[PDB]
Design a protein around this ligand. Structure first.
Ligand SMILES: [Zn+2]
Lengths: 135, 82, 178, 213, 325
RNA sequence: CAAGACGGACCAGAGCGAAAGCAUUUGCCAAGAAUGUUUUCAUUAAUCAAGAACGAAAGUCGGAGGUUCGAAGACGAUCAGAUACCGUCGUAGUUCCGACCAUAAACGAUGCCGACCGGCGAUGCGGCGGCGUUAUUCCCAUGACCCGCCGGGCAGCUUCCGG
């Protein structure tokens, strides 16, 4: 099962790596992006909410999603790194970096790295008050 | 410092100063005599003229007002009076 | 063969020029990668070659040079080359607390402290490296160490004095089984 | 239990004739199950493709949005939908001690595709400059923004999508704006940063044939 | 084959290439590197020590001060030069060498002296650094006697007078591309690129000028025809009164004013080395910072730290809450 | 697709305003400092009880609208005694229009006008004098830089003027 493409040419997928401040999401799609091939969250691998956003969970997610692409036949992936964005933090965290490193480790060719986070032009009001956020 | 002849300053020093801060007040402007390339009629034009001036016997603009000195049109010749 | 390009700002051109040999020597000796600096696009470009030893070394090189460009010392990103579990969390100072103007500047001050000492104090407790861009904070270290440093920094820029910050961060380091 | 991916089909998706590299790649589609038609399902997709995957000589910091419009038996033709810049490039372009000048026009081309053009331009520190900042005054900025608006309006209204796209690949518009704005203030990095598709005419078939081949 | 200390610093094992190996005691005994003294007791002993003649060191100095390089030269450097002179005079005929060398020819360009040309990793518009090229990048690499000099002054004087010299590469070198510092008040040139005050008039006025010397013996130097280089922008500013004591730092106007001793502690100047075999056993990935010592409280910094801050003009505006040391 | 919101990065010890305050594009409307003048009036001025306009945020009346946030409030966690911290939801409010209130660490914790007493070079605006590089060498002026000078400003550094 998979595309009828010769061994020379490779097929491309887009791996939405979304590392929020609670877990990670691995949404492998077509180059169009409409239909999903796979998505491995942090919570599907570790049975603990404390370890949900751990780099170990992202590493396991990247390994499992790479196994899923090898079972179908995707050999090279473009990367769209993402953070929570918007009003919240814009920079992707350690989970995205760990997932990208683990996916590059498991024999997978890397195409274009793109930092696509929903950066607002002008934000709405912040989640916290005037006092602050994060302890 | 502590030794300056305020009565007789050098002309370069007084030329550098602001026109109201001179030892005796004197303007920075003049009255220039302008000759048009076409006509032979001589015209007195103030150096910082604010209005556009027209030649009496040529009906041609001589100068255009600016922020400071009025710039002359191309081809006109000017001579400073004394 | 694949490659990664990373940009450099105008203020980071001269440290890149001075420390150039210390950058490209471990990239080309231990990792076996081709490296150049495109002056027109102002990008450090690293590509794999036929005699590259293994995969994921290109990502190690990209992390090394990007950590150097963000403001870390060349040895502190050589640590990224050697060690495996090292990451980079960075965040804006105005993220946790809405600060405007001079207040924001004072927050930067109490991340540095007098002589930078407070900053160095965190680097002794959380065992991390921290770089202050003009409104941005970058942490390099292990995951729990990055989280510890981030809690310390966010405690500093919410108004808490450095003494409470040192006491809390040393207590957390004590319970961290270090 | 039942794998849904055995019911899926792999279609080929191809670039238009404007670009050297045609084969965009593969597209997954569910099979026709009587009610819904497989060709109708993929008729409204936007394809994100970099310029390095389209022409070998060109630069990689430009992105094209493509609409798939027709199905020819495991072959998909794409039509131009938009153009954008890489966020890494845009982050690198915004330096501090300079002035950013932005313009936008709503312009209709000859064959009816109503587009929105965005143009950005940065002020340039010159060769013998000693001053730190290179700010332009407000009237100069307005004059530059004007000159961008009439340049884009002139060079889009008289062309069609073939000529407009063949202008946007090497960015004739940006170089024309840079050349024309030297008399007001010298500019550093001017591009058409984003192109939006506001309105499309009635869809035809011969237009897609002459656009593709 | 006269070996200078630059070949010994670079582990240039060219002992098999040549046969007439001649060295000085004071070009090998001053090296503080441990690995060089380690390999010295390991390397095959066919090098031998030879002393120059006072007449020949006198002649070498005589035309070296006509070349304009005599302040840049050192005593052991003159030993090496006159040793090569004596060897080539005693083996080869002396008619090959020419004295009182050629004049300079001036041809300026619009390029800045800080343009990053001839850097290996830098490439304008392909120039890549490959592990096949890491052994190749030494310098501009192009029969019996020669030199193993790495300093540009040695190459300059040896090529002006006319000896064929070589590098760590086995083949003889052809062209010498480098930079020099020229005073723009006294017009005296120094080959030492590290210094910042000139030897003649002592002002902080040395500026970079590029020099290329061909194999014939003809030298041409390029100035920069750029108004930014010779600009008096950040030069006149109000100076503080000179303070004394153990803690006072002075604005450094002369090359030899007595500064107070303000050194760093050992822990403050430890840099982490990552390729040590026992680095992985470290409880922390990094060397711990020093905050306990008195030097940490006095905000003592290294000479390297804060280099672009000095390049800002004092007559400017900094950030409101920042203080410049 | 729609809804209300907000004008990031450029954004600086830069600018404007009596202050509170002011940052998307374009058009219109009426003002304003400064600079330049060998223009005009000829003391028309300074500070100002009484009195009068503006006046952050929060709040109150009548209308519209409610995207985010969100006091109160509801739950959930946490305890010898917790009833503040934390998490989810969410009312008034936060938005606009027309009426009210005249309060801030409404701060330079420093009345306004005028004179004199050290220095320096950066910046914003205006004016003056200039070798040169630039608009692919521009055919003339003009814009951008470069070098000085003067005037009004936002500021800085230095000093045993003296306090
Ligand atoms: Zn000198």
């Amino acid at each position: 099962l998979g595309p009828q493409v010769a061994e020379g040419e490779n097929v491309f997928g887009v791996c939405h790596i979304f590392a929020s401040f609670n877990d990670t999401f691995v949404h492998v799609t077509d180059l169009s992006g409409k239909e999903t091939i796979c998505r491995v969250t942090g919570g599907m691998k570790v049975k603990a909410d404390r370890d949900e956003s751990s780099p170990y969970a992202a590493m396991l997610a990247a390994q499992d999603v790479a196994q899923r692409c090898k079972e179908l036949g995707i050999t090279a992936l473009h990367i769209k790194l993402r953070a929570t964005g918007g009003n919240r933090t814009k920079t992707p965290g350690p989970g995205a970096q760990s997932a990208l490193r683990a996916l590059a480790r498991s024999g997978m060719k890397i195409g274009r790295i793109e930092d696509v986070t929903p950066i607002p032009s002008d934000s709405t009001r912040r989640k916290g008050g005037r006092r602050g956020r994060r302890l | 410092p502590l030794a300056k002849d305020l009565l007789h300053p050098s002309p370069e020093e007084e030329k550098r100063k602001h026109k109201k801060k001179r030892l005796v007040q004197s303007p920075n402007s003049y009255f220039m005599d302008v000759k048009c390339p076409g006509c032979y009629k001589i015209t007195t034009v103030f150096s910082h003229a604010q209005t556009v001036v027209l030649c009496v016997g040529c009906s041609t603009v001589l100068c255009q007002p600016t922020g400071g000195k009025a710039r002359l049109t191309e081809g006109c010749s000017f001579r400073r009076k004394q | 063969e694949e490659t990664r390009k990373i940009p450099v700002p105008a203020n980071r051109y001269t440290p890149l020029k001075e420390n150039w040999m210390k950058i490209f020597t471990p990239i080309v000796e231990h990792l076996g990668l081709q490296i150049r600096f495109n002056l027109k696009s102002r990008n450090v470009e690293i590509r794999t070659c036929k005699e590259t030893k293994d995969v994921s070394a290109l990502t190690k090189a990209a992390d090394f040079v990007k950590a150097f460009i963000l403001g870390f010392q060349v040895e502190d990103a050589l640590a990224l080359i050697r060690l495996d579990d090292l990451f980079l969390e960075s965040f804006e100072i105005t993220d946790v607390k809405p600060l405007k103007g001079d207040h924001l500047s004072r927050a930067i001050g109490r991340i540095a402290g007098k002589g930078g000492k407070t900053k160095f104090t965190i680097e002794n407790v959380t065992r991390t490296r921290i770089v202050l861009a003009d409104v941005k904070v970058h942490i390099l270290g292990s995951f729990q160490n990055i989280k510890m440093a981030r809690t310390a920094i966010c405690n500093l820029i919410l108004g808490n004095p450095p003494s409470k910050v040192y006491g809390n961060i040393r207590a957390v380091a004590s319970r961290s089984a270090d | 239990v039942v794998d849904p991916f055995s019911k899926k089909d792999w279609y080929d998706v191809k670039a238009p004739a404007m670009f050297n590299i045609r084969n965009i790649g593969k597209t997954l589609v569910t099979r026709t199950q009587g009610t819904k038609i497989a060709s109708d399902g993929l008729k409204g997709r936007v394809f994100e493709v970099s310029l390095a995957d389209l022409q070998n000589d060109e630069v990689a910091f430009r992105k094209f949005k493509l609409i798939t419009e027709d199905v020819q038996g495991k072959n998909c033709l794409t039509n131009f939908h938009g153009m954008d810049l890489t966020r890494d490039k845009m982050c690198s372009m915004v330096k501090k001690w300079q002035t950013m000048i932005e313009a936008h026009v709503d312009v209709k081309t000859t064959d009816g595709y109503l587009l929105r053009l965005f143009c950005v331009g940065f002020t340039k520190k010159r060769n013998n400059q000693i001053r730190k900042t290179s700010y332009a005054q407000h009237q100069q900025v307005r004059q530059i923004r004007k000159k961008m608006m009439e340049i884009m309006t002139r060079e889009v209204q008289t062309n069609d999508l073939k000529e407009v796209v063949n202008k946007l690949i090497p960015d004739s518009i940006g170089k024309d704006i840079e050349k024309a704005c030297q008399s007001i203030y010298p500019l550093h990095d001017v591009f058409v940063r984003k192109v939006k598709m506001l309105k499309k005419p009635k869809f035809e078939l011969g237009k897609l044939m002459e656009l593709h081949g | 084959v006269v070996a200078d200390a630059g070949a010994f610093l670079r582990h240039a094992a060219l002992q098999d290439i040549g046969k007439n190996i001649y060295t000085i005691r004071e070009v090998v005994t001053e090296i503080r590197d441990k690995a060089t003294r380690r390999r010295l007791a390991v390397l095959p002993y066919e090098l031998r020590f030879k002393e120059p003649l006072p007449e020949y060191v006198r002649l070498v100095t005589e035309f070296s001060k006509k070349t304009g390089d005599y302040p840049s030269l050192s005593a052991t450097d003159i030993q090496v030069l006159a040793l090569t002179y004596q060897l080539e005079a005693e083996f080869v005929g002396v008619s090959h060498l020419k004295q009182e060398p050629q004049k300079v020819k001036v041809s300026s360009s619009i390029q800045h002296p800080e343009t990053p040309l001839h850097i290996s990793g830098f490439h304008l518009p392909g120039g890549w650094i490959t592990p096949s090229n890491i052994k190749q990048i030494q310098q501009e690499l192009e029969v019996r006697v020669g030199c193993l000099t790495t300093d540009f002054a040695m190459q300059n004087v040896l090529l002006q007078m006319g000896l064929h010299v070589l590098a760590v590469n086995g083949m003889l070198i052809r062209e010498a591309r480098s930079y020099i510092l020229r005073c723009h008040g006294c017009f005296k040139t120094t080959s030492d690129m590290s210094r910042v005050f000139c030897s003649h008039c002592g002002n902080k006025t040395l500026k970079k000028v590029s020099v290329t010397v061909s194999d014939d013996g003809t030298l041409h130097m390029h100035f920069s025809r750029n108004p930014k280089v010779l600009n008096p922008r950040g030069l006149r500013y109000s100076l503080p009164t000179p303070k004394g004591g153990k803690y006072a730092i002075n604005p450094h106007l002369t090359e030899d004013q007595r500064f107070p001793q303000l050194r760093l502690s050992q822990k403050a100047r430890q840099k982490t080395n990552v390729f040590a075999p026992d680095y992985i056993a470290g409880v922390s990935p990094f060397v711990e910072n020093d905050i306990s010592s008195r030097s940490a409280t006095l905000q003592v910094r290294d000479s390297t730290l804060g280099a672009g801050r000095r390049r800002l003009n004092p007559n400017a505006s900094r950030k409101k809450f920042v203080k410049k040391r």
